[PDB]
Amino acid sequence: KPGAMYRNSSKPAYTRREYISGIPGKKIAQFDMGNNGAGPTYPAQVELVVEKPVQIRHNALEAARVAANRYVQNSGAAANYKFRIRKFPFHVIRENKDGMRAPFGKPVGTAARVHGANHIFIAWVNPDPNVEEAWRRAKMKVTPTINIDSSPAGNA
Amino acid sequence: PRVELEIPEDVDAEQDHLDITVEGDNGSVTRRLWYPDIDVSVDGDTVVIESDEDNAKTMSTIGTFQSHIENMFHGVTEGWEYGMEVFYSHFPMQVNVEGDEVVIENFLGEKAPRRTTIHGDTDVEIDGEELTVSGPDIEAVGQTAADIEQLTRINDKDVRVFQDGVYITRKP
Amino acid sequence: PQPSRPRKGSLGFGPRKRSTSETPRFNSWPSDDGQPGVQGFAGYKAGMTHVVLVNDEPNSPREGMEETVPVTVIETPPMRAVALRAYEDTPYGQRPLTEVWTDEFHSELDRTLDVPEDHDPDAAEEQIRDAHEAGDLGDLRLITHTVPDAVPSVPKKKPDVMETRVGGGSVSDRLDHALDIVEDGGEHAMNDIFRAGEYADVAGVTKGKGTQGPVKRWGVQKRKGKHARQGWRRRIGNLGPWNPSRVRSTVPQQGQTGYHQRTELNKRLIDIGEGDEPTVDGGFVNYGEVDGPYTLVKGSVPGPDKRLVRFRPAVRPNDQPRLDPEVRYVSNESNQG
Amino acid sequence: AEFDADVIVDARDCIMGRVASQVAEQALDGETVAVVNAERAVITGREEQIVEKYEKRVDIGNDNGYFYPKRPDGIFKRTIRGMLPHKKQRGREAFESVRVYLGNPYDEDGEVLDGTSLDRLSNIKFVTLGEISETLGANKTW
Amino acid sequence: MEALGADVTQGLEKGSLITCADNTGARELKVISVHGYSGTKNRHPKAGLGDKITVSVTKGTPEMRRQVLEAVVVRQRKPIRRPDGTRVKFEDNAAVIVDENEDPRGTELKGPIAREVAQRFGSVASAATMIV
RNA sequence: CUGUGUACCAGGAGGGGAACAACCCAGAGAUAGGUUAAGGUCCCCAAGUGUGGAUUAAGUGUAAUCCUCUGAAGGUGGUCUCGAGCCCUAGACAGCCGGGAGGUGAGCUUAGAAGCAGCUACCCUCUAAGAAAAGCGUAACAGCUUACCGGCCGAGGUUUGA
RNA sequence: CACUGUCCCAACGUUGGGCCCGGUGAACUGUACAUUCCAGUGCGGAGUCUGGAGACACCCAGGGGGAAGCAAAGACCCUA
RNA sequence: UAUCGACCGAGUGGCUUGCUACCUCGAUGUCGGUUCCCUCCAUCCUGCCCGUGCAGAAGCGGGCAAGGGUGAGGUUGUUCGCCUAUUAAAGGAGGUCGUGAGCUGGGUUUAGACCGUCGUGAGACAGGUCGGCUGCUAUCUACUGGGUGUGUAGGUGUCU
RNA sequence: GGUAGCCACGCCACACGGGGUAAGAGCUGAACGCAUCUAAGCUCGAAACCCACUUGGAAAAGAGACACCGCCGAGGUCCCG
Ligand SMILES: [Cl-]
Ligand SMILES: [Cl-]
Ligand SMILES: [Cl-]
Ligand SMILES: [K+]
Ligand SMILES: [Mg+2]
Ligand SMILES: [Mg+2]
Ligand SMILES: [Mg+2]
Ligand SMILES: [Mg+2]
Ligand SMILES: [Mg+2]
Ligand SMILES: [Mg+2]
Ligand SMILES: [Mg+2]
Ligand SMILES: [Mg+2]
Ligand SMILES: [Mg+2]
Ligand SMILES: [Mg+2]
Ligand SMILES: [Mg+2]
Ligand SMILES: [Mg+2]
Ligand SMILES: [Mg+2]
Ligand code: NA
Ligand code: NA
Ligand code: NA
Ligand code: NA
Ligand code: NA
Ligand SMILES: [Sr+2]
Ligand SMILES: [Sr+2]
Ligand SMILES: [Sr+2]
Ligand SMILES: [Sr+2]
Ligand SMILES: [Sr+2]
Ligand SMILES: [Sr+2]
Ligand SMILES: [Sr+2]
Ligand SMILES: [Sr+2]
Ligand SMILES: [Sr+2]
Ligand SMILES: [Sr+2]
Ligand SMILES: [Sr+2]
Ligand SMILES: [Sr+2]
Ligand SMILES: [Sr+2]
Ligand SMILES: [Sr+2]
Ligand SMILES: [Sr+2]
Ligand SMILES: [Sr+2]
Ligand SMILES: [Sr+2]
Ligand SMILES: [Sr+2]
Ligand SMILES: [Sr+2]
Ligand SMILES: [Sr+2]
Ligand SMILES: [Sr+2]
């Protein structure tokens, strides 16, 4: 199904699992990447900031995450970097798949609501920003236009 | 912005609306330098290119106008000359100047001669496997040269294996 | 998925109405190249016969062999070039400037136009030459007329008049050539313009066929099989789609078919002569006997017998001229049979 | 011919639309206007885009017909008609008391209307009515 | 193809049954296609004296029957016109089976053959007994 | 499709919006003069071809609202404006000319590998420079280069943010 | 299998109409206006509204594109 | 990155299908075909080009481009599709899924009848099967052809 | 069996070349000293565009041009074959 069907916050928050059942698992493999054994004690901290409020399905969350991290293997399988996708897909989404009769939909997926300006991804690295390219690929697979933002780096 | 081109001593420059004419011993050339808000004039023994505008687009043309005029000075004095060679592998290619156009016969074995008309007072002198294109107007000369190389253009087959043709060997 | 198919008939010969002038009016002339000279002539159609010719195509396998060729016999007696009309170039194309006439007119030209009794051939010629000096002179054409009295097979005596452009070298030499031709009395012959073996465009008003339906007039199909028996034998399927709600002029409809002007490109002139060598035994059906100045045009020529046809040096020939073909035989066998 | 014009305008190097606007304005004021040198009037912009527009107008049509002029004569007089209520008596009158010419058939040199002139030294992206006509296929009578 | 040297009014169509003027074991041939032909809507693809056609064997030895083969039209009933105007027509419609290289497949040809066919398939003509 | 609050259409003229139930002005006795509203002032068509200034070259645009007026993700040395860091008349940036040198063909490896297959180390002379060689190139060499230095030239250049 | 214009692909001809003239002489249909065309708009399928384009009037013959043509208060479907 | 190309993401079309129930129930005739006319381009062929895992020949992929062309046949009512031989190629789509006051009437879908299934039965079936009707003299408008008048403002002829 | 006539199944005719472009190949050329097919300029280049060719066309309301004849008579109508 197209992102067109769910990218907008056009429905009330539907996340209570005590009342919703049969929610598909998440396609997002991990939320912590890189040397997650270590702390965010790095020199440079870049982040991908979404420019529009939107709902991002776990479908796109996993494609963007892979697209970025997989590429961040320009540093090495066990390289010296950190990477965190900080949002979780809490919104349960449905699809009415009798025409418009009794059309409440059936759970078909989950998405993460992200407001304009929130950062969806954050990386921590040493002056080794192959990450800015990692996000160019990441922002390439999520609905909104985004802006890559270096948070702590005067090391031009 | 304004630029001033000191004109060579054997040369003479004259304006006429938007047209400029440069005359030296090697002949003369007349061009047209028409762009918005760019005045080109002959003050005494210097050519001036000026404009009140300074935007990227205006500055671009000013620089182009300059080279065009310095090229004209050079054309009417030392003249312009491009060198060429005819390289064939199997079929003996015959290159000749007949009238006001160069004719290439038996190219790659063809029965029909290929030909290109020469541009302006450009003279094409052929001597053996070498050709030399020369004249005061670089535009007219440059084209003629290129025109000859383009005349042996080949799209159908693999160029790496079929290289017969007249190529430009020397650029001024 | 309905197979493709070209449309029925050409949209380039319309509207398909009756011709305005039974006499053809060329709408183009040859290029100015050779010496000056009238660019056209005219005659009356008599009929057809065939001829045996020695193939003369240098690229033909049959070069030098007998070859039968259909031919249309055109009676082409001498015409009269009675005036020299000049055109001037103006902001609205060309316009007739003035004319130069003669004194000697055919005894029966008074059946068509009002023959001049008081004219000034110099006042006119002067105006023309002044114009040429100013550089406002568009081409020069000769008012031309036939002498159907020289043709017994044609009932009419009333001449057919038509303008024919003069082309040639320089406008000056040309204007002088034109003026000489007129001054004389005007008389000139097919010989003067054409040579056998050259290509000429023939114009003429085709045979008239009154009103005819879509099938014959546009070449549309006749209803087929069962469709041909339910009440519609030769009526097109539909006048058009629902929308646009109107009948386009492009859908084949009944009407005037025939009696239109047609200019037939590149017709080979097989032979120019005079006498009765090409006549047919019993006479050309619905015409009469030929015995005078005539022309043999290869192939067909628009119009029925007796209709005035016009000649013009081919304007877009495809072959080079092979002058004076060798005519080994000219059928004189009766056409009745 | 003979057009006793009260005003003779010189369209040479003038914005066609801007000239047409004033000429209509005057014809409606009772003035008899003669526009001269139409072939030399101009219209600003990209020649390629401008020509596409005038070529499209030539292609449009059907049985009812959409006759569109190709010579500077008509392109201009049509332009003026678009600024007049020609289907009305008052508007047809004005329009009819207006004629456009190729070159100048008069002895007087026409006048140049204010604001309508284009300065060739400051502009390069513009086209001549004559150039449109030639591209549209018209027989260069001028 | 090389010019015939005569004008031809196709006397056959897709579906026509004709004689097999040779000794290949095929007695009757059915025209299926005309090499190099493209007709127009609703028109039955036609064939005539001189054309190369694809054919299926209708009558003949079991071994030849049903085989789809190429052939050349050698004779036809509808008249043809020769350079000198004379018309020429035959008693029947016939075709000689021919191979990939246009050589007759059979050893002998039966009946006359138009001289015109020689200007294309010479090997066929040079196996003819009578050439008219 | 189905709620809710409200004003409107329905049952609301007249002015505007090309036309146009509910968008804008406006709520309206007749008649008259005047001044405005919305919306307009190049012509069609009443009023500006108004003023100071900037941007745009695509006819972008000349389209408030909208079933009705599209234009997106992704890209842009198109162009205008603003800012930050750094280099620069002790001569920058680019171009052109010249120099690019010895130990040494480093050692190991290997038949061989000599800047450049691999591994390891990556040193010192001359000097204004010149890598235990960044990129081609050879079977390997060679050869072209380039880092680096000097000259000619002479004014801004370069990097990044909005 | 045989045969053939069913078809390729249409042609010519025959008789009766059709067309012109004398005489006779209805019906269907009609809110009005009406020379339209391309677009748009509008209850979303306009000769009549908007913007353009085109348009001198009247008459003869024609084949029927449109008048969501004319004909019968849809017989399908739902509702009572 | 010749070529193929998953995931995910952004769109355009209005050709399929679905949804809605705005228009029409004092009627806008249904599928397919046929005939005849116009068009669209997301191009199958033809013209001119670029790249190649381009020697050539031939392919493969891409670009401009809608002038022209895109046909004949076997089963089936078919649309679609499968199949055969030809072909430069035998492209797709819009026009009330163009076209019944043009045709056809094979399919659909009345009244007769049989079979299977279902039903106690009448009878039914989003199953199959045989049979089963196609009205009208054109008022306006539209176009194809033909005339009579008026305007421009005596006549003939030729032209633009 | 077949004349005329009408017909096709018969027979005749239906370019070459200019001009301007697209994709593309290039020249000169700056912004940006170099480079650069492009920004100004230019040389080329499609069955496509324009012309060339054919057909219609003085009701083109700017309702056209030329020549001659005529205004007591040019020309036309009716009539007749
Ligand atoms: Cl039109
Ligand atoms: Cl400009
Ligand atoms: Cl076939
Ligand atoms: K209904
Ligand atoms: Mg006869
Ligand atoms: Mg005979
Ligand atoms: Mg068919
Ligand atoms: Mg009510
Ligand atoms: Mg006003
Ligand atoms: Mg726009
Ligand atoms: Mg009702
Ligand atoms: Mg395309
Ligand atoms: Mg190849
Ligand atoms: Mg339909
Ligand atoms: Mg209908
Ligand atoms: Mg019906
Ligand atoms: Mg009827
Ligand atoms: Na038009
Ligand atoms: Na149908
Ligand atoms: Na096409
Ligand atoms: Na089929
Ligand atoms: Na319908
Ligand atoms: Sr909602
Ligand atoms: Sr339902
Ligand atoms: Sr995005
Ligand atoms: Sr159809
Ligand atoms: Sr003409
Ligand atoms: Sr019937
Ligand atoms: Sr309609
Ligand atoms: Sr004004
Ligand atoms: Sr202003
Ligand atoms: Sr201003
Ligand atoms: Sr709508
Ligand atoms: Sr909008
Ligand atoms: Sr965008
Ligand atoms: Sr009728
Ligand atoms: Sr396109
Ligand atoms: Sr192709
Ligand atoms: Sr099927
Ligand atoms: Sr039926
Ligand atoms: Sr009047
Ligand atoms: Sr280009
Ligand atoms: Sr008139």
Q: Are residues C60 and C108 in the same domain?
A: no
**Which residues lie below 8 Å from residue C325, measured CB to CB, with a gap of 6+?**
C53, C54, C56, C196, C197, C270, C271
Task: Please count the CA atoms within 13 angstroms of the CA of B57 that sit on its side-chain side.
Answer: 4
Residue with tokens 């300059």: B66
**Other beta carbons less than 10 A from residue C185's beta carbon:** 15
For tokens 């702590």, the residue is: A152
- Residue B138 belongs to what H/E stretch? helix B138-151
Q: Which of B54, B79, B104 is the last residue of a domain?
A: B79
Nearest chain C residue to E86 by CA distance is C68
Domains in chain A: boundaries: 1-156
Please state, in angstroms and rounded to a whole number, the distance separating the CA atoms of residues E102 and E97: 9
Q: How many domains is chain B built from?
A: 2
Radius of gyration of chain A (CA): 17
CATH number at residue E12: 2.40.150.20
Written as six digits, the tokens of E26 are 């095929």
Give the β-pairing of E68-75 and E26-34: unpaired
- The answer to whether the CB of D110 falls within 8 A of the CB of D42 is no
Domain that holds residue C322: 39-77+189-206+258-337
Measured in angstroms, the CA of C12 and the nearest CA of chain D are apart by 15
Q: How many residues does chain E have?
A: 132
Helix (H) or strand (E) holding B134: strand B130-135
Q: Is B93 in the same domain as B122?
A: yes
> CB of B142 within 8 A of CB of B82?
yes
Q: How far is CA B167 from the centre of its chain?
A: 16
The answer to whether A80 and A125 are in contact (CB under 8 A) is: yes
Examine residue D69 and say whether the peptide bond preceding it is cis (omega within 30 degrees of 0).
no
Kindly give the distance from the C-alpha atom of residue C314 to the centroid of ligand 42, in angstroms, as a whole number.
Answer: 40
d(CA C257, CA C239): 19
Number of structural domains chain E divides into: 1
> Strand H and chain E: which residues 52-71 have CB closer than 7 Å?
54, 68, 70
HSE, side-chain direction, 13 A CA sphere, residue C142: 30
Non-local (6+) Cβ contacts of C337 within 8 A are none
Pairing of strands A44-50, A119-125: antiparallel
Q: What are phi and psi of E123, to 5 degrees?
A: -65, -30
Ligand 33 centroid–CA A7 distance in Å is 28
Same domain, C73 and C83: no
Largest Cα–Cα separation, chain B: 60
- Domain housing E92: 1-132
Regarding whether B158 and B87 lie in a shared domain, the answer is: yes
Burial C197-214 (b: 16+ CB within 10 A, else e): bbbbbbbbbbeeeeeebb
* Same domain for B171 and B124: yes
Report the CATH number that the domain containing residue C89 is assigned in CATH. Answer: 3.30.1430.10
Whether residues B87 and B75 share a domain: the answer is no
Nearest amino-acid residue to F1, taking CA and C1': A100
Measured CA to CA in angstroms, residue D16 lies from D19, D58, D113, D116, D135 at distances of 5, 19, 11, 8, 18
Secondary structure of C140-162 in HEC code, one letter for each residue: EEEEEECCHHHCCCCCCCCCCEE
Closest CA to E77 of E2, E3, E18: E18
Domain that holds residue D58: 1-142
Specify the long-range contacts of residues C68-72, CB closer than 8 Å, at least 24 apart. Answer: C68/E83, C68/E84, C68/E85, C69/C270, C69/C298, C70/C298, C70/C299, C70/C300, C71/C270, C71/C278, C71/C296, C71/C297, C71/C298, C71/C299, C72/C45, C72/C46, C72/C47, C72/C48, C72/C296, C72/C297, C72/C298, C72/C299, C72/C300, C72/C301
Would you say the C-beta of C222 is within 7 Å of strand G? yes
Q: Give chain D's end-to-end CA distance (angstroms, integer).
A: 17
Looking at C219, C241, C257, which one is the last position of a domain? C257
Residue from the list D62, D63, D142 with its beta carbon closest to the beta carbon of C91: D142
Peptide bond into D72 cis (omega under 30): no
Domain count, chain D: 1
Q: How many domains in chain C?
A: 3
Indicate if B103 and B60 belong to the same structural domain: no
- Distance CA(E20)–CA(E28), nearest Å, equals 6
Instruction: Please report, rounded to whole angstroms, the spatial distance between the CA atom of protein residue C83 and the C1' atom of nucleotide H157.
Output: 12
- Shared domain for B114 and B171, answered yes or no, is yes
Q: How far is residue B43's CA from residue B14's CA, in Å, rounded to a whole number?
A: 9
Find the domain containing B19 and state its range. 1-79
Measured between CA atoms, the residue of chain C closest to residue E43 is C5
Name the residues in B113-152 having a C-beta closer than 7 Å to nucleic acid strand I.
117, 119, 138-139, 142-143, 145-147, 150
Q: Which of B17, B46, B79 is the last residue of a domain?
A: B79
What spacing in Å lies between the alpha carbon of C214 and ligand 36's midpoint? 16
User: From residue A153, how far is each of A46, A124, A126, A135 by CA, in Å?
Assistant: 8, 11, 10, 17
The pair of structure tokens assigned to A107 is 């759970």
On whether both C18 and C160 belong to a single domain, the answer is no
Q: What is the CATH number of the domain that holds D113?
A: 3.90.1180.10
**Does C29 share its domain with C43?**
no
Indicate if B114 and B170 belong to the same structural domain: yes
Looking at the structure, do residues B13 and B86 belong to the same domain, yes or no?
no
Pick among 3.90.1170.10, 1.10.579.10, 3.40.50.1100, 3.90.79.10: CATH of A1-156: 3.90.1170.10
Question: Does B58 lie in the same domain as B107?
Answer: no
Q: Which of B51, B79, B107 is the last residue of a domain?
A: B79
Query: Which chain residues have CB less than 5 Å from ligand 3, an ion?
Result: E 14, 33, 45
Phi, psi of D105 (to 5 degrees): -70, -10
Rounded (10°) CA dihedral C164, C169, C174, C177: -90
Strand ranges in chain C using DSSP code E only, listed in sequence order: 37-38, 41-54, 66-75, 80-90, 93-101, 137-145, 161-167, 199-205, 208-212, 255-258, 261-275, 292-298, 308-313, 327-330
Q: Of E76, E89, E105, nearest to E12 (Cα)?
A: E76
Residue B85 belongs to a domain with what CATH number? 3.90.930.12
